[PDB]
Structure formats: C-alpha cells, structure tokens
Amino acid sequence: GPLSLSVDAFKILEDPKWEFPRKNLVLGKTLGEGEFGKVVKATAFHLKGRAGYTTVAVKMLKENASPSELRDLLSEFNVLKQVNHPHVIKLYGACSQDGPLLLIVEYAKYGSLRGFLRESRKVGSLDHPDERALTMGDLISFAWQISQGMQYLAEMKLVHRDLAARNILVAEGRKMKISDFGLSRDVSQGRIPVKWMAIESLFDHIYTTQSDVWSFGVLLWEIVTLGGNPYPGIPPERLFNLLKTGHRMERPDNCSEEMYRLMLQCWKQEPDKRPVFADISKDLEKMMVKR
Amino acid sequence: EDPKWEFPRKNLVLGKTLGEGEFGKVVKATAFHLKGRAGYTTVAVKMLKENASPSELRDLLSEFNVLKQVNHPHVIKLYGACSQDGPLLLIVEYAKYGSLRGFLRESRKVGPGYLGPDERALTMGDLISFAWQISQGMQYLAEMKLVHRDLAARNILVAEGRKMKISDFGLSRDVYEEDSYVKRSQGRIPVKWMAIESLFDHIYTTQSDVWSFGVLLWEIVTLGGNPYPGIPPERLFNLLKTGHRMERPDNCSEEMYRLMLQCWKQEPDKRPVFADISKDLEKMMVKR
Numbered sequence A: 001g002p003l004s005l006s007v008d009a010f011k012i013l014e015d016p017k018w019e020f021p022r023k024n025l026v027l028g029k030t031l032g033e034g035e036f037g038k039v040v041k042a043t044a045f046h047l048k049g050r051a052g053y054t055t056v057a058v059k060m061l062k063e064n065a066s067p068s069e070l071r072d073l074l075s076e077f078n079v080l081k082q083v084n085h086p087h088v089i090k091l092y093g094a095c096s097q098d099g100p101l102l103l104i105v106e107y108a109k110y111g112s113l114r115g116f117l118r119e120s121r122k123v124g125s126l127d128h129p130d131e132r133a134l135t136m137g138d139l140i141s142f143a144w145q146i147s148q149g150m151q152y153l154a155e156m157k158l159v160h161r162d163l164a165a166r167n168i169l170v171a172e173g174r175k176m177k178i179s180d181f182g183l184s185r186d187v188s189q190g191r192i193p194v195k196w197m198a199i200e201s202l203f204d205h206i207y208t209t210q211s212d213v214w215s216f217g218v219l220l221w222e223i224v225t226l227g228g229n230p231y232p233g234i235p236p237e238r239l240f241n242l243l244k245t246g247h248r249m250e251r252p253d254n255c256s257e258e259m260y261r262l263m264l265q266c267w268k269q270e271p272d273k274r275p276v277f278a279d280i281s282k283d284l285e286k287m288m289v290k291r
Numbered sequence B: 001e002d003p004k005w006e007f008p009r010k011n012l013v014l015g016k017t018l019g020e021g022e023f024g025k026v027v028k029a030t031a032f033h034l035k036g037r038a039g040y041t042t043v044a045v046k047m048l049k050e051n052a053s054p055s056e057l058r059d060l061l062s063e064f065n066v067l068k069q070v071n072h073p074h075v076i077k078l079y080g081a082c083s084q085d086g087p088l089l090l091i092v093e094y095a096k097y098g099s100l101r102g103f104l105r106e107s108r109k110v111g112p113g114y115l116g117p118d119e120r121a122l123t124m125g126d127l128i129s130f131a132w133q134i135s136q137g138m139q140y141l142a143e144m145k146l147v148h149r150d151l152a153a154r155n156i157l158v159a160e161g162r163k164m165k166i167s168d169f170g171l172s173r174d175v176y177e178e179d180s181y182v183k184r185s186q187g188r189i190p191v192k193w194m195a196i197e198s199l200f201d202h203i204y205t206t207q208s209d210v211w212s213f214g215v216l217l218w219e220i221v222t223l224g225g226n227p228y229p230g231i232p233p234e235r236l237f238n239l240l241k242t243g244h245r246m247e248r249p250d251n252c253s254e255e256m257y258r259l260m261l262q263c264w265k266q267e268p269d270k271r272p273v274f275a276d277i278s279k280d281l282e283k284m285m286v287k288r
C-alpha cells in the first residue's frame, strides 16, 4: 500500500545527502510528548559538515503508532527536503538504518510560540514573575515573520493546513519558525482542529492557500491575546453553524482597530475576499514603520 | 436528535476524568432518572476536548450510531447522549475495574495476583474465561456485519463481577456489502494490532478482527504485556511479510499458542472464525 512503499523507500540508502550516521546522535531530554510520538533534544556530531556537536531536535514515533502517524512523519520528511527559508524549521536529515526512524530538525531554544507567549507579559541579572516583557512591536514582528514564511510556502505551491501558535517554534533571537508539516500538501475526514479551520474546509473539505490565510487569522488572535484559547467556552461541534451564520471572534483586549480588521478579513466567508500572504506582510510592514 | 436516546442535560452530573488522550476524554458521571430508573445511576461520559478535529467528531458520532444497534452481555451498554444544548456527550455503562489492560497489569503487583475466589485472584481458567466472553461478543459483532478494527486489551472494559465489555467503537465499520471495509487513506489503528492485509492492502474483514483477537490473547496471557517487545512499529512491515510472529509466552499452553498462531495465518481464509475460537476456548476450559 502507499505506506509500505514509502517505508521501504525510506529504509533504503537512496538519499546520502540526508542520511545521518546513528552512532553520531546522542539523545537527551524530552522536549514534548504525545500518545504516539515524541520530540527529544539531541547533540549530533559532524552534522552536515559542521565541526563538533550541533544541538538538534529529534522527532520519533512511540510503540503504539498507527499507519497515520508513520505517514505524517515520512510526509514531513519529504516536504522539509524541498524547503529552505529563514522562517521555516530546518531539516538536517534522518536515521533510517538503525532501529526507529528519527527525523532530525533544528532546535528552537524557546520552544512553541504558544508556550513562549503564555509565559510573557504585555507592556507599553535580576528576576521577574514572568519570563519576559513584550510590546505590540514584538507581536507585530512575530506575525510578520510567519507571513514571510507562509508567502514562501504559497509560492512553492504548498498548503500547510495546520497553522496555529502551537506549531510555530521560537528560536534564538526570537526568530519564528513554521513547523509540523505532517499534514501539508502540494496544491476525507481531516485531522486539523475545528477551531483553526476555514469554513470551506469544514463544509467542503477544501484546502488552499486561502484556507491557510483563515488559520493565520486565528493565529493572529492567539498572538494578540498572548496565547488565548480561540472561541472559549464554545464546543467545537457548535462552531460550524455559528461560522455559517456569520459569527466571528470579537475584538480582544489590547488589540487595535487595524490589527482586528486584518484578523476579520482573514475570516471572510468567500476565500477570494481574504488577503493573500503578501497583502498580510504588507499590512504588518506598514503598522511597523507607523509605530 | 434521536428520541429514544436523547437524554436531558440537567439530569447529568459530570465528575472526575477516567481517561484522556489526543483531543478526547472520558469522565465518571451520574444520571438522574436514566431510562426510567429511579434516582441516580453511575455512568461514564465520552466527550471531545477543545482542540477536536472533524475526525474525532465523526468518530464519536460513529460510535454512537453503532452502539444504538448492538446489544450484548459483552459489549458496552449505551444509555444515551446529550447532543442538543451544547457539547456532544455519549453516556455509556460504567465499568468498575476499568480497562482489561489496566486490570491485568495491576494483577502483577496487587494480590493475590496471578496464581497459574477473590476479584484480584487470577488463574489461567479466569483468563480463558475472559478471552471467551470477548470472543462471544465478537461473534455477535461479526453476525451484525460489523468490523471493530481496534480490538486490543486497552479497548476491553472490566465491569462488576469481572465481565468483559468490548468498547471503543469509534473506528468500527459496516461491512454488509462485500464483507470487507477498505479505505484509500491510512488507518488510525496501532500498527502492532493490525492484520497483514490491513497493513499492506487497507482491507478490514472479520478475519482481520480475528488477527487482532490473537494479539489480544497474547496480551491476556502475558498479563498486559506489550506486543512485539522492543520492535519499532515501522519494522512490522518487513517482519510480518517474512513470516515472523510473536513467540510463545511463558504461562501459555501449547493449545493456547496454537490458537494465536492460527489467528496470525498470512492467508485470511486459514484463520479460525469467532464461533470456532469460542469452541476452542470452551474445550480448553472444561479440560481443567
């Protein structure tokens, strides 16, 4: 079947560029864990012709993994090979010759954007009750970096499908990296959380760059609320009809008119009425120079 | 939605979490005036988490639709659902000992344990009986033209009097036409419980449920061990194709092992049917 073919292709030595010798990989602490998959920190010796040990993250399956897990991981590997951008997580390679399949990716010292934000406070060698302080300028900065990454992906004819604050990684110098390409595809029951999905994805199962834009609007909302939970107290099952009848999230606190207007436009019912990612970057670039 | 199954939300009180995984959760609950029982009845409630995808929603709805049609002493009882004024809540039977996997693993550290009268005291006779109750439930399920697809010790619940209840019907499918269920895309059943033709061919029949039953059997007689110990899921493709199967575990009889092996025949025709699995277990029991 399609998976046994990919598995077998993967387990052969066909891509010497991406194969990393297993003996050169030393696995450390767990960075995150779900039921069937795990991410650990690691050091990699002589990775990609680099001197000494490079700090990396390793993605791997757990023992109760289903074929849909195996598929997601292999599919991410195949997408990340074709991709190169400062705001997209970097793939270093894979170990396919010695035990479990391991994906080796760039290590993001702050972890997920969602985590980063909830540990922060909004403002206008000591110590504080919060990890850091963030201005609207930082938040606009974060959104712009993601929109750049997304513009690159849309130009590459790739639909991410799972855009959300938990899938953006925060690297050294607070650089945003789009991550989790398990569900991406080159442009039936979906595995994207309902609350981030575009109306046409929910009703017609259609996924395009414009449905990525809708998801981007939910992420913006997540950013300006510093890690809020979208549609709080509304059951995911109730959301279809609220959206169909034209309900949207209200303007959050500490959110400006111009910022909220951009969110709303991302959530237009007709995908043609939504901004493209270039328009989005433009809006953020303008906000920035204008303080 | 359905008159015979819709239950008044105000009559349902939710308690502690009994289990939660990726985007779904089970809570202990109590229901007032349930199916005309006086007073409160202790129940369990299955529901979605905030980050649910359409797949999880469709799975909860499909489990509801299946449990509506099936009634058997060894299949989890559905009481009803709250599906109107908010979140979808599935109301099912509460099983006091929890999952079979959990129950058997507990018997490793909780006396009297496995002995080779008390609820916690287990002999091989008790284990054969557990397997048999499950097989009778599966036999009925197969007669009702269903494939469970996700038969495993984690999906069997242990109720009052140590009765087995097949549960977790989210993935089960109708096979009235063709006697097979096939989908184009990848399944969500753990690789290690999947039949060889489910793995390579995306085909699910009662005979792939039989394969899964063999793995469950192995789980039972190892008292909740993990299948293909230390083998990566990805290695199962080549390993099953080349003819490797799990080894005979320690407190397993030759007849019991012969039954498992039969469940793991490459050719699905050569596997026993659930009716014949039940007969084999009946004979094992009475010859002791």
Ligand SMILES: COc1ccc(CN2[C@@H]3C[C@H]2CN(c2ccc(-c4cc(OCC(C)(C)O)cn5ncc(C#N)c45)cn2)C3)cn1
Residues within 6 Å of the ligand: A031, A032, A033, A034, A036, A037, A038, A039, A057, A059, A060, A061, A069, A070, A072, A073, A105, A106, A107, A108, A109, A110, A111, A112, A169, A179, A182
């Ligand atoms: C299908 O294959 C799968 C599926 C799921 C998984 C694991 N799942 C749960 C949710 C999803 C992904 N998960 C994580 C966990 C940690 C990280 C992560 C966390 C992290 O945190 C750093 C810190 C905050 C210092 O702990 C840094 N980095 N750097 C790179 C990555 C990556 N990738 C990370 C990213 N995703 C955890 C693995 N493989």
Ligand SMILES: COc1ccc(CN2[C@@H]3C[C@H]2CN(c2ccc(-c4cc(OCC(C)(C)O)cn5ncc(C#N)c45)cn2)C3)cn1
Residues within 6 Å of the ligand: B018, B019, B020, B021, B022, B023, B024, B025, B026, B044, B046, B047, B048, B056, B057, B059, B060, B092, B093, B094, B095, B096, B097, B098, B099, B102, B157, B167, B170
């Ligand atoms: C898609 O909809 C979903 C999907 C999955 C889930 C929850 N998932 C995780 C794995 C799967 C099913 N899960 C559970 C959790 C608890 C129980 C459970 C556990 C339980 O434990 C009793 C004890 C051990 C004394 O606490 C008793 N009962 N009785 C009925 C049920 C049911 N159902 C239970 C069964 N399945 C937890 C919820 N909704």
